[PDB]
Design a protein around this ligand. Sequence first.
Ligand SMILES: *[C@@H]1O[C@H](CO)[C@@H](O[C@@H]2O[C@H](CO)[C@@H](O[C@@H]3O[C@H](CO[C@H]4O[C@H](CO)[C@@H](O)[C@H](O)[C@@H]4O)[C@@H](O)[C@H](O)[C@@H]3O)[C@H](O)[C@H]2NC(C)=O)[C@H](O)[C@H]1NC(C)=O
Ligand SMILES: OC[C@H]1O[C@@H](n2cnc3c2N=CNC[C@H]3O)C[C@@H]1O
Ligand SMILES: OC[C@H]1O[C@@H](n2cnc3c2N=CNC[C@H]3O)C[C@@H]1O
Ligand SMILES: *[C@@H]1O[C@H](CO)[C@@H](O)[C@H](O)[C@H]1NC(C)=O
Ligand SMILES: *[C@@H]1O[C@H](CO)[C@@H](O)[C@H](O)[C@H]1NC(C)=O
Ligand SMILES: *[C@@H]1O[C@H](CO)[C@@H](O)[C@H](O)[C@H]1NC(C)=O
Ligand SMILES: *[C@@H]1O[C@H](CO)[C@@H](O)[C@H](O)[C@H]1NC(C)=O
Ligand SMILES: *[C@@H]1O[C@H](CO)[C@@H](O)[C@H](O)[C@H]1NC(C)=O
Ligand SMILES: *[C@@H]1O[C@H](CO)[C@@H](O)[C@H](O)[C@H]1NC(C)=O
Ligand SMILES: *[C@@H]1O[C@H](CO)[C@@H](O)[C@H](O)[C@H]1NC(C)=O
Ligand SMILES: [Zn+2]
Ligand SMILES: [Zn+2]
Lengths: 494, 494
Amino acid sequence: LTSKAAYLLKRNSLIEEDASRKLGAKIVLTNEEKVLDDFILAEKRKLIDDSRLNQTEYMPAASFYRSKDFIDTTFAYKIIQDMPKGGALHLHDTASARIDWIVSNATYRDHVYMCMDQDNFVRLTVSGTGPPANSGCEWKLVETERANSGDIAAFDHWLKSNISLLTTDPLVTYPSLDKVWGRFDKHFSQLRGIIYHTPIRRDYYRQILEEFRSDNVQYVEVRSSLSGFFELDGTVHDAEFGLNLYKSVTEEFQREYPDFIGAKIILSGLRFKSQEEILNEVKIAMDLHKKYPDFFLGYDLVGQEDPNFSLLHYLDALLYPSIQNPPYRLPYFFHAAETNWQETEVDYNLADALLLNTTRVGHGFALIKHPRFTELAKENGVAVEVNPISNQILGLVRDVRNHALVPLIADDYPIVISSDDPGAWEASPLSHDFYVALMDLCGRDTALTFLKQLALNSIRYSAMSDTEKVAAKAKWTTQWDKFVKTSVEGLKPH
Amino acid sequence: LTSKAAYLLKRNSLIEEDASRKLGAKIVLTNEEKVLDDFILAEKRKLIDDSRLNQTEYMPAASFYRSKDFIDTTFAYKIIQDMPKGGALHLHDTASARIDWIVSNATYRDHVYMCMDQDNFVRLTVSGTGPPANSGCEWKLVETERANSGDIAAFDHWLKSNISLLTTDPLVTYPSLDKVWGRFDKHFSQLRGIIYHTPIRRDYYRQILEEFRSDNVQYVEVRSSLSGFFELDGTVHDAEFGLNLYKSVTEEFQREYPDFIGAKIILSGLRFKSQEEILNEVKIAMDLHKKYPDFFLGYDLVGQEDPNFSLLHYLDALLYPSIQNPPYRLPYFFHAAETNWQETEVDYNLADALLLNTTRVGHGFALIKHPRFTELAKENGVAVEVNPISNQILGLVRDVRNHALVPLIADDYPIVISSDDPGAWEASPLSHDFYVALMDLCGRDTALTFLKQLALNSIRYSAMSDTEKVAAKAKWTTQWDKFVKTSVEGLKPH
Ligand SMILES: *[C@@H]1O[C@H](CO)[C@@H](O[C@@H]2O[C@H](CO)[C@@H](O[C@@H]3O[C@H](CO[C@H]4O[C@H](CO)[C@@H](O)[C@H](O)[C@@H]4O)[C@@H](O)[C@H](O)[C@@H]3O)[C@H](O)[C@H]2NC(C)=O)[C@H](O)[C@H]1NC(C)=O
Ligand SMILES: OC[C@H]1O[C@@H](n2cnc3c2N=CNC[C@H]3O)C[C@@H]1O
Ligand SMILES: OC[C@H]1O[C@@H](n2cnc3c2N=CNC[C@H]3O)C[C@@H]1O
Ligand SMILES: *[C@@H]1O[C@H](CO)[C@@H](O)[C@H](O)[C@H]1NC(C)=O
Ligand SMILES: *[C@@H]1O[C@H](CO)[C@@H](O)[C@H](O)[C@H]1NC(C)=O
Ligand SMILES: *[C@@H]1O[C@H](CO)[C@@H](O)[C@H](O)[C@H]1NC(C)=O
Ligand SMILES: *[C@@H]1O[C@H](CO)[C@@H](O)[C@H](O)[C@H]1NC(C)=O
Ligand SMILES: *[C@@H]1O[C@H](CO)[C@@H](O)[C@H](O)[C@H]1NC(C)=O
Ligand SMILES: *[C@@H]1O[C@H](CO)[C@@H](O)[C@H](O)[C@H]1NC(C)=O
Ligand SMILES: *[C@@H]1O[C@H](CO)[C@@H](O)[C@H](O)[C@H]1NC(C)=O
Ligand SMILES: [Zn+2]
Ligand SMILES: [Zn+2]
């Protein structure tokens, strides 16, 4: 009737037309699921409106250092903690478990040594033939140092404080992409000596499995170098040994916990190695994918993407599987366009990843800046592994609401949410990144369809076979319905 | 043939396909324009590669406070300075001239008083009836304080410092959207008393025109309140008086400088006023658009959009022109979705703006987050006024390379670059925002086709009639050809 009423009808048409395109709009919720969705929506909308109208800071989009405790004090984070989120498809094996486990378990073992390097960073290693040979760092046995500390708890807390990235605010202590990446590489060099010892590495991978299961994540796809596992006698094993160790741990864990879906491993090489070495690693990946077709997925090039070699620089090595007669199909999981640049060597790695038939693309922070690349990656079914906390800390974004992949989420783009390296910055396996996605990557009228669609895409866009995908969806559905029923009974009066 | 060569063919075909979607990709440059583009590209690529590979900060992406002098020492900024950029379609009348003009001219006039308010901010006013009526701050003539100052240059520089937003780094001293918006409103309240005096306002608008012509901008569309211009006797004039004053100044300026295209005015109301006041402003805008259709353009709601009323909240007043018999078509230039939020009232103001047949959208920072809104605006031809430095300073973004509208640039969306309030933060009329757009909003292989497309879209998406647009483009083409010829003769060896 009224021109105002006709305008409002057209407004509802347009707004529904726009808001139905977000990822997860296809989700239909049962009444109990709607109860949980309303529970989450109330808190999220209260926070959004309090920040917007009272003109106060929106903590969910703040630095994870400052917002971590705040997140830990919200009811919705408890809901997400109890929620089974499916799979974490983008992880690195050396920083996916608590640093506290390394401090309280690994550095308590025999022959574990420490030393303060030239940069005032603690380094931990394992050497069975007495103190290790090094003059650039004065090595002291950790047992004697802990005994001499007097206060053992303070010593362990300091040991975690000199290793963790969250001891101070990374956005302040390392206020540049270069500085924070230097701190990240320093963290890895600190943990390299001790974490590559074979027993400690096996127990650390076991801890990765346990911690991700406890956070109600049932499936993982872990990137690992797989080689360099050493013993007290000095023996250094090849990548196949590491793959077999991971496989045995995973099979034992699956035997213990039937609710767990499992784990699969991707081989990661470095973006600054010689093309000869990268070709050697590609050949190793081909052999391991042949010999272990169900557990070994493929190959990936990791390391800081801006200052190191491009995908094209390794092109020969990456084309070696395809030039065979018959051609061999080696899957890829490229980190691509993890950069703030445009039309450079870094973000144009997206073209290489798409042309090399990559299974998934890590980050894709510059993907939105390339229209045809986005279209082609969506058409081919290449999902994007978005790691919001990783992208904030490692210098890509500062306000998480300004993340580059938010519009792609709002237009139903194939995406999964993962943590990259959770342990380095003291983050939960997937619930903290899920909370960040819920509070920063979707609109005010989006609470639970988004999270359930992320949980579904973590299985759909995994590397599992179709039969494995169906079985994994069955297990995840069992856990999800159990969680929904328990939460609703815990919140709904009777 | 060669697998490497065939892959390279596919890769270059894909990259050409993707990079042709960018704004201005269809621009064809003459050989002289190619020389200028090569110079700009060399400078830009040097900066980009030095920042990326040597791991040093990319200064153009930093805060305008820190990067201002660095920009002032580049060759590309010199070229942009000499370049006629067309028009500035997003300006505000009280902050489109240098603060130095107010300090060195206006506060040297008679009847000008000053006071330090309770926030230690200098406020300037004009009172022809002795000391000003307000006693909350002791009003003293600027002449007396300048006399007692000792160093007059230091006194005037302190005036500019207490007035300007760029005296300190706003991203540090006001590290919140709300705090920096408070500083912006404080700046406006500082200059309100003196800038609304009729002679000073007239000369300030004249100075706006002069400064924008000096920076090779030939056309402007300025948003103004147009009402409240007062005299020494206390007479307060209506919006028609101020509009006619602007029109007379513009006609005189056009007569003096034939190379100038001209100026047109938009009526801006504040989005926190009463609905009755906004309705009366809409009626006044209708009357002024009827009486001065060639000089008066339309209406716009300005002011901080996050904590104030939405476009829907004013729906009655906004639908008043269309409900008449016959319906009246009042053009709109709504500031829309200048926010980091999603699926809230602020960014859903885009739906109201689109349904109200807005000519252009101011900022539209969250437009990319809404796909159907972007598509519908693209179909309807609604351009977006991108003000990069304003979006950085006022708290929307920190790294300009993470600007939300960069992907829309890369997919050829209708946009025009402007400055919002340049004089507020010591920015050149349009050259600085153009340099920021060049170095932050387009790829490494994009220098001059982008800038020429910006200049062309500035004329296509103006409010000028179809007959006036051809003549405006003729003037701009004359100036552009002179600029290209002179710059090439100054750089080309022959
Ligand atoms: C990424 O995946 C792509 C799709 O699987 C790969 O492209 C495919 O590469 C395979 C193996 O090299 C090609 O299959 C062979 O093609 C040729 C020629 O047959 C075709 O061409 C002739 C004339 O052009 C035509 O008459 C035929 O009907 C075929 O169309 C023969 O040697 C073999 O019989 C065999 O079929 C595919 O043609 C090709 N597909 C496409 C769609 O291009 C690509 O190599 C993969 N890249 C990587 C890095 O793994
Ligand atoms: O296995 C350890 C190595 O992994 C890299 N690495 C670890 N996390 C990431 C890495 N590389 C690239 N992108 C960011 C993030 O996904 C670096 C480290 O030396
Ligand atoms: O006429 C002056 C008033 O205009 C507003 N104003 C001026 N510039 C802007 C404003 N508000 C909204 N968006 C950002 C920017 O474009 C506030 C100021 O008090
Ligand atoms: C703003 O804060 C007050 C108290 O500080 C609170 O009552 C009010 O609900 C808040 N506004 C919103 C929108 O949450
Ligand atoms: C590590 O410890 C040293 C000395 O104990 C201290 O000075 C230094 O700041 C610490 N570094 C980090 C990164 O915690
Ligand atoms: C460390 O944890 C492993 C299991 O991961 C356990 O077997 C071992 O006993 C622990 N070590 C210590 C010293 O408690
Ligand atoms: C990096 O710095 C070196 C010297 O410090 C210089 O020669 C080079 O041109 C710089 N830029 C690069 C490598 O892009
Ligand atoms: C200020 O500018 C006006 C207008 O250009 C000029 O007439 C006047 O002389 C200037 N100086 C003053 C008022 O001191
Ligand atoms: C303004 O001046 C006062 C005193 O001269 C000073 O304390 C204050 O910090 C200044 N404020 C700004 C915003 O420059
Ligand atoms: C917008 O224009 C269309 C025709 O172009 C008209 O039907 C519609 O009523 C207009 N809406 C408004 C709000 O002016
Ligand atoms: Zn990663
Ligand atoms: Zn504006």
